[PDB]
Amino acid sequence: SHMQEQYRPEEIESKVQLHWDEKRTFEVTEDESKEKYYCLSMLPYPSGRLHMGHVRNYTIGDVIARYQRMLGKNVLQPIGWDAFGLPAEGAAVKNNTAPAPWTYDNIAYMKNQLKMLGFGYDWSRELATCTPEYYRWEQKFFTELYKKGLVYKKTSAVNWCPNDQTVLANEQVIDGCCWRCDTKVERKEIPQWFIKITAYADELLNDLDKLDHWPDTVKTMQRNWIGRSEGVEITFNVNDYDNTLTVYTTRPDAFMGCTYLAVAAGHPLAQKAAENNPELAAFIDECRNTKVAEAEMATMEKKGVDTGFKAVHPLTGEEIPVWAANFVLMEYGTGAVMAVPGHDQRDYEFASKYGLNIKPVILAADGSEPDLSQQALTEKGVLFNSGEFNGLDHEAAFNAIADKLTAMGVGERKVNYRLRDWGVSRQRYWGAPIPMVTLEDGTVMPTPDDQLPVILPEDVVMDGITSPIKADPEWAKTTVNGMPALRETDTFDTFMESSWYYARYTCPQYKEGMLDSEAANYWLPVDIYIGGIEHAIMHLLYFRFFHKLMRDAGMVNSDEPAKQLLCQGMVLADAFYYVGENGERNWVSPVDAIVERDEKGRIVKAKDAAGHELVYTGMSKMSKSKNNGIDPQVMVERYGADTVRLFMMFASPADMTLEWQESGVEGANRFLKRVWKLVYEHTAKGDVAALNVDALTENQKALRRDVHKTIAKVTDDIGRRQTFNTAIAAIMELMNKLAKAPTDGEQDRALMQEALLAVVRMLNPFTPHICFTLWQELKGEGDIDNAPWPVADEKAMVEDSTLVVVQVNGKVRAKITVPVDATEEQVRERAGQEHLVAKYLDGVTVRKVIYVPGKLLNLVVG
RNA sequence: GCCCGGAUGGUGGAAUCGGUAGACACAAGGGAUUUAAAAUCCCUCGGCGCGCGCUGUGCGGGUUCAAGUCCCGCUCCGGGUACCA
Ligand SMILES: CC(C)C[C@H](N)C(=O)NS(=O)(=O)OC[C@H]1O[C@@H](n2cnc3c(N)ncnc32)[C@H](O)[C@@H]1O
Ligand SMILES: CCC[C@H](N)C(=O)N[C@@H]1[C@H](O)[C@@H](CO)O[C@H]1n1cnc2c(N)ncnc21
Ligand SMILES: [Mg+2]
Numbered sequence A: 001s002h003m004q005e006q007y008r009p010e011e012i013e014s015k016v017q018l019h020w021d022e023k024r025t026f027e028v029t030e031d032e033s034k035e036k037y038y039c040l041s042m043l044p045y046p047s048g049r050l051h052m053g054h055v056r057n058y059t060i061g062d063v064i065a066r067y068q069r070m071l072g073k074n075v076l077q078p079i080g081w082d083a084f085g086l087p088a089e090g091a092a093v094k095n096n097t098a099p100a101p102w103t104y105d106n107i108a109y110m111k112n113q114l115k116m117l118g119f120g121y122d123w124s125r126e127l128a129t130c131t132p133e134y135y136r137w138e139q140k141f142f143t144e145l146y147k148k149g150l151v152y153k154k155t156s157a158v159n160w161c162p163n164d165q166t167v168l169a170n171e172q173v174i175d176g177c178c179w180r181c182d183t184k185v186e187r188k189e190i191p192q193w194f195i196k197i198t199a200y201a202d203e204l205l206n207d208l209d210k211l212d213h214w215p216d217t218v219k220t221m222q223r224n225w226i227g228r229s230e231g232v233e234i235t236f237n238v239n240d241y242d243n244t245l246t247v248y249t250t251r252p253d254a255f256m257g258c259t260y261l262a263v264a265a266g267h268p269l270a271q272k273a274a275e276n277n278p279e280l281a282a283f284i285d286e287c288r289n290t291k292v293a294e295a296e297m298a299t300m301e302k303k304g305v306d307t308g309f310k311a312v313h314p315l316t317g318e319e320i321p322v323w324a325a326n327f328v329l330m331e332y333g334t335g336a337v338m339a340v341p342g343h344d345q346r347d348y349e350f351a352s353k354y355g356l357n358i359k360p361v362i363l364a365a366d367g368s369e370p371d372l373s374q375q376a377l378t379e380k381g382v383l384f385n386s387g388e389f390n391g392l393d394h395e396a397a398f399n400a401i402a403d404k405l406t407a408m409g410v411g412e413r414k415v416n417y418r419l420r421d422w423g424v425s426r427q428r429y430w431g432a433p434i435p436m437v438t439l440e441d442g443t444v445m446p447t448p449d450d451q452l453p454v455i456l457p458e459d460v461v462m463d464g465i466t467s468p469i470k471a472d473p474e475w476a477k478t479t480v481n482g483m484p485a486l487r488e489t490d491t492f493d494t495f496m497e498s499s500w501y502y503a504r505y506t507c508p509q510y511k512e513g514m515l516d517s518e519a520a521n522y523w524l525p526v527d528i529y530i531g532g533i534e535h536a537i538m539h540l541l542y543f544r545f546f547h548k549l550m551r552d553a554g555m556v557n558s559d560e561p562a563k564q565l566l567c568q569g570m571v572l573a574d575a576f577y578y579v580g581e582n583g584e585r586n587w588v589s590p591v592d593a594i595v596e597r598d599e600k601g602r603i604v605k606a607k608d609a610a611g612h613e614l615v616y617t618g619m620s621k622m623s624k625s626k627n628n629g630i631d632p633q634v635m636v637e638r639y640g641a642d643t644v645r646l647f648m649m650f651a652s653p654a655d656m657t658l659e660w661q662e663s664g665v666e667g668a669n670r671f672l673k674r675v676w677k678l679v680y681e682h683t684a685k686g687d688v689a690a691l692n693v694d695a696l697t698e699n700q701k702a703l704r705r706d707v708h709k710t711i712a713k714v715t716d717d718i719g720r721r722q723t724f725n726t727a728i729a730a731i732m733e734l735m736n737k738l739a740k741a742p743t744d745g746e747q748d749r750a751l752m753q754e755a756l757l758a759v760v761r762m763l764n765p766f767t768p769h770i771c772f773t774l775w776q777e778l779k780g781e782g783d784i785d786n787a788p789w790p791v792a793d794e795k796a797m798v799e800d801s802t803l804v805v806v807q808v809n810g811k812v813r814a815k816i817t818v819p820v821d822a823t824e825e826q827v828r829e830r831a832g833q834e835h836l837v838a839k840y841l842d843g844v845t846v847r848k849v850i851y852v853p854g855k856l857l858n859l860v861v862g
Numbered sequence B: 001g002c003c004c005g006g007a008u009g010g011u012g013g014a015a016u017c018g019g020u021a022g023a024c025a026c027a028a029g030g031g032a033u034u035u036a037a038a039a040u041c042c043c044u045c046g047g048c049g050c051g052c053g054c055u056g057u058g059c060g061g062g063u064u065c066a067a068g069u070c071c072c073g074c075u076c077c078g079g080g081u082a083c084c085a
C-alpha cells in the first residue's frame, strides 16, 4: 500500500487484470433485482493477430460497458469467436497444418491480447462457433426451417476454375484469371440450398421505421438493398418458339413505346437461337467470362447481339426484335425486360449504339412532344402515340394498361423485390455441415434428430484442391429409413453462425436446446450493438431476419434484436502488393515498403526492402487479407493498454472513418503522467477535511463550476453522443485548471479531493487500470468498477453572466461580458461603449439590429 | 456503373439546434532548468500586408443580417455490391 512517483504501467496493469479474473468482476447472472444492459460488440474472425480496427471496436464497447456498470446496472459484455471461414483453409495448406488447430492457435493468441488490453468481458460465456456444441443447434434449426417450407433447392451461378474443378470465392478471383493458376474462371450453374428471406421482405423493410435509435445511413442502405417495388409482369408470344417470355416493369405506362426486348445471357430463348446463329453462340460463350459480381456487370460496356426471334407486342400487334445483352440481371425480375429506349437512359445508349428504333410515347411537362436527339426523357407525364391510351396521366396509364393486360390474360400486378434469397451452400471444408440426406431411393430429406449433429472431423489432411469430407467417400455414408444414404458434403455460409451468436451468449452452456428462453428474454433485445459500417447490409439484415425466425419458433419475444446501432468508422491503412512469379498476389506491409511521395501528400512510387515494384491500392480497411494491420502489442508493451485505449478514443469520434497514424500516442502517455503526478502530490500531504459549500472565494467557486460542468458534458458525450474525443478533451481542460489552482489551504484541498475523485471516475471507462489504482490512493468506497457515476450539482453550475459577441455587418469587432438576465437595450448600450464598434458606426445609420439572447448581436449598417 | 458516407492549419480533430472558425492534442521552431542528455516547464504557431486590416473550412455558383453548417452542379477519397469476414 504505497504509491511511486513515476507512473509504471507494466507493474500496475497485469496486477489489476489478475484481480478482475480472480474476483470474477465482469461475470454476471440473470439478476432480477438489477436492471439489465446488454452491450454487444461484433465477434472477430480469429485471423491470428489483432489490429487497430479491432481495438477501436472493443474499446468503444468496453467504455460503454464500464460507463453503464457505474450507472448501477447489470452489464453483460460478451466475447466469442467467428471461427469458421475461408482463410483458415489456405493458411493451413500453406503452413502444413489442418484448419482446426490453426484456428485454435489464433483464438489462443488473440485471447491473450484482449486480456492484456483489459476489456471487462464475461469470459465464462465464451463461444467458439467451430465447435459442435455451437453448430449442432443451427443444424437442428435448419431442419425445422425446411419443414416450415422456408428452405428450397435451386440452380445458382458460381465461380469455377475449370482445370482444378473447384469452387472459388469472389476474393480469390483477380483481373479475370484465378489467383493460383493462369487459367480463366467460368460461370457454372450448380444446385444449392437457399433460405426464403424474401418471405420476410416487407417485415424487414417496414420495421426500419420502428428502429429510431439506428442511424439513417444504415437504414436507408437496407431499404435500397431490399428495394420493394410495385409493377407488372407482362407476358409475350414468339413466332418460331413455343415457350413464352415474361418481363417485369415498374413503368407499364410506357409499354406502347416498347420498340425491342433485351434478354439476359443465361436465358432459355438464347440457347434455341444460338444453334443456327454462329455469332450469337460466340456471345453466349463470351458471357461465361462474366464474373459473379454486380460491380463488373454494370461497369463493362453494354454489348449485345440480335437473337433473330421476333416477340409479338400484344397491344400494337407488332413484331419486335429480341436481343441478347450483358447488363440484364438473371435473378432480379424474370430475366428479360421491355426496353423503352426513349424514356430510359440505359436503354437509350443501347438503342443509339446498335441503331434500334426510338419511339416516344410520354409527353413533356408542358404538354409538348419530347426531343429525343440527345438523351431520354425519364420523367413521367401524359401519354400520346399510344392508340387508345392517349391523353391519360401516369396514375391512369399505370392502371389502364395493367387492367387491359389482366383482362387479356397475359399480364399481372406483382410486388417485386431487389432482395434475392439467401444461398447458404458452400463447397469447402471448414464450415458447419448442412444436415440433408440423399437416400438410395433418389429422394432428398432432412437429417433426422438422433443423427444431429453432423460433426465435421477436425483430424484431417488437405491437398488444397478438394475438401477431405468430399474426397473420402466413406464419410458421406449413413443409414436412414433402413437403407443406404449419402449426407450433404456442402457446408454452411459463415454468416449462419454470426446470425444468432448474440442470442446464444445468454445461455452458452445450455445442453437441452438452442436457447434457454428464461435467460434469453431477460437480456434480449440488445441495448447497444457496436460493429463496422462494413456490416451495414449483409450481416445486419441476416442478423434481424434470423431474430424474426427465432421469434416465430417461440424462442424470443422481441420483434427486433438490437435497440441502438453504433457503426464505428473503418480504421484505414495503405495497402501494397507485387505479382508473384506464377501470378500470385503477395501483399507487402506498409512497414516493409519504402515510399516516394508527392508534394500534396499522395504516393507516387513504392519499393520494398527486397526490391520489387509494388502496386499501391490506396487507403483501405485494416485486415490480414491485404496485410496492412498494425499489431497493438508493441505499443501496449511500450506505453501500456490505457495509453493505447485513450489514444484510439481521442483521435476521432466513434462514427468517423479514421486513417491510422502513430503520431499522437505520446500525448496520451503525457496526459496520464500529469494525472498521476497531481494525485501523488495531493495524497502525500495527507487526509482532507469536509468540504464547506458556502465558504469559497470567486476563484474557488469558478473552479468548482468547471468541475461540475465537465461532469454534465462528459455524461452527455459518452451517454447520448458517443463523442469520446470531446469528452476526453473536456477532462483535459479541467486537469489543466486544477494544476494551476493552488492547494495550500484546507478548502482548496477539500475541493481538490472532489475534483480528483470526479476526474478519476470519468477516466475509468477509457483508462480502467490507472483509475483502479488512483481510486484506492484517493481512498474511495470499494472498487472503482462498481462505484457510482458522478452526478453534477445544479446549484454549483449556476452562471452570473454570459459572453456576447458584437458584429457590424456580420464581422466581429468586440466581445463583452453581460449579466444573464439582461435586455437587448442594455447589450446595445454596452456594445456602443467599445471603440472598435463605434469606429464603424460613425458616418452611417443603424438600419437593422439582430440580437440572439446571451449569444450574439449583429448591427446591419448602411 | 449503382447505393451509403467523408474532405477544416505541417497533422488528428473542435464548433452539439444557421450564429466568435481552429477548442483539446500531436509535430516543428526558439527559450529555460540540467555536468551534456533524458525528463519536466514556458513562448510562438492558417495565410497575405501588427496594442491593426483583409482573407480563410475540397472545387464552381446561389439564398440570408449571418453559411464549415442550408440549396443546385462538380472533383477526389473510403465502405458495400450477395462466396472476404
Ligand atoms: C458478426 C460478424 C459478421 C463479424 C465478423 N466476425 C467480423 O467482422 N470479424 S472481424 O474480425 O473482421 O472484426 C470484428 C469487429 O471488428 C470490426 N473491424 C474489422 N476491421 C476493422 C477496421 N479496419 N476498422 C474498424 N473496425 C474493424 C468489425 O466491424 C467487427 O465489429
Ligand atoms: C421506361 C423504361 C422501362 C424499362 N425498360 C424497364 O422495364 N425497366 C425495369 C423496371 O422499370 C426497373 C425496376 O427496378 O428495372 C428494370 N428491370 C426489370 N427487370 C430487370 C432485369 N432483370 N435486368 C435489368 N433491368 C430490369
Ligand atoms: Mg487537408
Ligand SMILES: [Zn+2]
Pocket: A161, A163, A164, A178, A179, A180, A181, A182, A183
Ligand atoms: Zn485456377
